[PDB]
Structure 1
Amino acid sequence: MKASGTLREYKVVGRCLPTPKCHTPPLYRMRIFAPNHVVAKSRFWYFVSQLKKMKKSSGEIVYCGQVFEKSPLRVKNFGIWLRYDSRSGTHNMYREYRDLTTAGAVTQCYRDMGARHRARAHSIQIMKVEEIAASKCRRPAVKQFHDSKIKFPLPHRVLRRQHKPRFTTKRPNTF
């Protein structure tokens, strides 16, 4: 999985072919993050084959729909669980962010594990993304944003170069 662009939260359910030995297989369910619906129905059969004796030529899915959030404008504290490979071993990890939807957090996890632990987006396994409320957050970087009557200025503001007079007679001021 490339995790190209913004991600997207898919739900996939799925079962295996009706056998003479057993009718009605239980039709399991996951929650896949993928940049479109094809990668969702290709990582679904990655996480299933690690957990059951189901492989994609011996089972079919019945539903792959985008499941999306119930409050896209309500700011939430997300706390997720990883299973990424490192070079030396692989590691269990808790992690928190702060965005407006779960697909805005798991996108921000792949951009974070890419930054800090050099894990590419293929070696990483989400266990479960759920929000927690405030004042149960362990991460102190997120925790300082949990204070009403918050104020901070914008120091040293710079952007939009070559936009004006690539050659000017007016010294920029940081402000």
Structure 2
Amino acid sequence: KASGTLREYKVVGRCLPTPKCHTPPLYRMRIFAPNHVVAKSRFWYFVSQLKKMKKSSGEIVYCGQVFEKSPLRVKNFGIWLRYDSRSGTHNMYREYRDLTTAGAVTQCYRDMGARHRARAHSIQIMKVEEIAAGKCRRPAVKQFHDSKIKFPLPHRVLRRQHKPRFTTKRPNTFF
């Protein structure tokens, strides 16, 4: 699949009732997809490789977006994923700091593409949970667990180039 800024979808589905089984079990997954159409397709991708349930023999009982409970609270997220490299498949655990669960997962897709050239179709995200500051393991995330965090902004690149595009004064980047 592709990505925009992903949302979290709770998708609940089941098999169609059969004379053998009148009340088949309900199954729930949390799927991170750009839209609900992609979410339902991703649900059938996983549940078919787990529970032997195809779309033609089942139905989507429910599909709704899961809103973030504390979008104004900064959190640490652990992501458990598996991805296919050019030679082999691997299991990875990663950390991100974000305000929303979906945003952390979008960070992970960007970071997998940046560091491993992994495309979204080659990634399976199996667990995303909020981690306390004491249980974080990556130094990149741990350095922001400091109640007196304080740093300057050293060398600010002039981003408003071309606005004059021709000026007498050379830009100052100290601020």
Are 2:158 and 2:171, in contact at CA under 8 Å, matched by a contact in 1?
Answer: no
Worse overlay, 157-166 or 95-104: 157-166
Are 1:81 and 1:126, in contact at CA under 8 Å, matched by a contact in 2?
Answer: yes
1:127-150 CA deviation, whole Å, 9 max, x = no partner?
111111111101111001000111
Are 1:10 and 1:34, in contact at CA under 8 Å, matched by a contact in 2?
Answer: yes
What is the CA-CA distance between 1:4 and the residue it aligns to? 2.4
Counterpart CA distance in 2 for 1:163 and 1:147 is 39
What is the CA-CA distance between 1:163 and the residue it aligns to? 4.3
Counterpart CA distance in 2 for 1:28 and 1:60 is 11
> How large is the RMSD of aligned CA atoms in angstroms?
1.0
Percent identity, aligned pairs only? 99
Are 2:48 and 2:54, in contact at CA under 8 Å, matched by a contact in 1?
Answer: yes
Worse overlay, 3-12 or 161-170: 161-170
Greater helix share, structure number: 2
Structure 1 segments, 4+ long, off by >2 Å, are 159-164
Where does structure 2 lack aligned partners over 5 or more consecutive residues?
Answer: none
What is the CA-CA distance between 1:112 and the residue it aligns to? 0.2
What is the CA-CA distance between 1:5 and the residue it aligns to? 1.5
Where does structure 1 lack aligned partners over 5 or more consecutive residues?
Answer: none
1:118-170 CA deviation, whole Å, 9 max, x = no partner?
10010000011111111110111100100011100001112333443201100
Partner SS state of residue 51, structure 1: helix
Counterpart CA distance in 2 for 1:87 and 1:151 is 41
Are 1:3 and 1:107, in contact at CA under 8 Å, matched by a contact in 2?
Answer: no
The correspondence of residues 60-79 of structure 1 with structure 2, limited to 5 A, is 60-79=59-78
Partner SS state of residue 116, structure 1: helix
Taking structure 2 as the reference length, the TM-score comes to 0.96
Greater strand share, structure number: 2
Counterpart CA distance in 2 for 1:148 and 1:161 is 34
Counterpart CA distance in 2 for 1:33 and 1:104 is 10
Worse overlay, 162-171 or 53-62: 162-171
> Which residue does 1:167 correspond to in 2?
166
